[PDB]
Structure 1
Amino acid sequence: GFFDADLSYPTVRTERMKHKRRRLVQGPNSYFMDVSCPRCRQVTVVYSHATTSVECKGCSKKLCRPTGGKALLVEGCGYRRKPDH
Structure 2
Amino acid sequence: GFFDADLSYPTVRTERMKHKRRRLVQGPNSYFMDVSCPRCRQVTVVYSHATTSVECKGCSKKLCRPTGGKALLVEGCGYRRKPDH
Tell me which interval the TM-score lies in, with the shorter structure as reference length. over 0.9
Aligned length: 85
Gapped runs of 5+ residues in structure 2?
none
Gapped runs of 5+ residues in structure 1?
none
Corresponding residue for 1:50? Answer: 50
Structure-1-length-normalised TM-score: 0.99
1:61 is displaced (CA, Å) by 1.2
Distance 1:58 1:80 in 2: 20
Distance 2:23 2:47 in 1: 23
Residues 24-47 of structure 1 show CA distances to partners (whole Å, capped at 9, x for unaligned) of: 000000000000010111100000
Runs of 4 or more off by more than 4 Å in structure 1? none
1:53 is displaced (CA, Å) by 0.5
Corresponding residue for 1:71? Answer: 71
The root-mean-square deviation of aligned C-alpha atoms, in Å, is 0.4
Structure-2-length-normalised TM-score: 0.99
Corresponding residue for 2:81? Answer: 81
